[PDB]
Amino acid sequence: SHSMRYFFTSVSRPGRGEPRFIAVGYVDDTQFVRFDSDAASQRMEPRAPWIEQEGPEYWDGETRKVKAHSQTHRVDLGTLRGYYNQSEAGSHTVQRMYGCDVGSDWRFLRGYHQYAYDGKDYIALKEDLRSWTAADMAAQTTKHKWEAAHVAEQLRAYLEGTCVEWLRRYLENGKETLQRTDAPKTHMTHHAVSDHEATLRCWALSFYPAEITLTWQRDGEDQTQDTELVETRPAGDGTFQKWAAVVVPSGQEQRYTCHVQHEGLPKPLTLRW
């Protein structure tokens, strides 16, 4: 399973000038391109070595296209302010995500195109890539207009065809990293809270992709009481980190086992103190 995803945020600046626009591109959990209106180049920039392989015609295209995306969102911010009957004094946010998934065969699996205003669902293309999920009556108006203009049909042609063609190209060219898994480097730590009570903490580091499961079990039986899970987090170097802890009576540490599932492990690992 693989994906390509583009994320766009536009933020109106009522004090002066035009909205802040930030675009980012991903293949699975690897960011590969950026654009930022506040940045000085006014180009789509590379963020992974394997996309720097692309020639100038690629960078001119993506820059032209991303600037046109930027304008579309500027205009959208105006439309929405009118629809929701808001003043020009407030700063508002528009966000768009689109992209495609492929299965292990590299064939079209799924498509995406969804949109939010001030952080709430507005309009989304449904799984079939033919109909829409409008959240409220403003979005309903957009739904009727987009149906009339055959927007679904146009997005479908990209997401089913051209989108997967790029993803395929990128997967080949980035195969040394994008198609390599990095298994978690695991270990455990002990923290005496008192004479009676102690904390075991089970660590997963330097792993890719981000998807991982850490579970504790006491005496070979899943335990959720007295545990904690932190959200999975980026190391900074393209890999991720996570941990899980459990509070345990002092001297009972050997009952408890940490279980680690991840794509880069052929079998799940088990750890014990």
């Binding site: 991303v66 995306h69 439309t79 207009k145 790029w166």
Partner: peptide
């Protein structure tokens, strides 16, 4: 690669 054009709301 980005789509050639995205729909405006209006």
């Amino acid at each position: 690669g980005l789509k050639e054009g995205i729909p405006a709301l209006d």
